């Protein structure tokens, strides 16, 4: 019995979808709850005409948020592979 060991390796940065993202590696995300991104924007007025009700300065303070997403994969090991890796045995070939 034999095996097969050809895999088409793909990478997140080599793929074209990395143009959609701005990949950031930050090692302590597990302590993070929510990441906000608060913005402040004031509007430009326009000078009013004669007798019109006029505007005034209006500032707007909004706040974006982050989204958590956990991904995973399980994988297993046989016990004979474990006792082969933890210690070598002499003997025949």
């Amino acid at each position: 019995g034999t095996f097969c060991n050809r895999l088409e390796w793909v990478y997140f940065l080599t793929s074209g979808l990395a143009a959609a993202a701005h990949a950031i590696k930050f090692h302590d995300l597990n302590k993070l709850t929510t990441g906000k991104m608060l913005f402040h924007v004031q509007v430009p007025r326009v000078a009013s005409g004669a007798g019109l009700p006029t505007s005034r300065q209006t500032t707007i303070m909004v706040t974006k948020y982050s989204e958590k997403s956990p991904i995973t994969i399980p994988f297993e090991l046989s016990a004979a592979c474990l006792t082969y890796l933890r210690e070598t045995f002499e003997g025949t070939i």
Partner: protein
């Protein structure tokens, strides 16, 4: 709930904002989550405790 004073006191960055629709419409139709829209000059950003 949200410390809006820290937005008005801390130094920001300068970005070219490009909202999709008009910004007062996006404010009044509640696309964003938390809003602090007002008019005039609030002195709220001064009484620091």
């Amino acid at each position: 709930m949200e410390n809006w004073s820290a937005l008005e006191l801390l130094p920001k960055v300068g970005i070219p904002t490009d909202f999709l629709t008009h910004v007062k419409t996006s404010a009044g139709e509640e696309m964003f989550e938390a809003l602090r829209i007002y008019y005039g000059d609030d002195p709220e950003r001064y009484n620091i405790h």
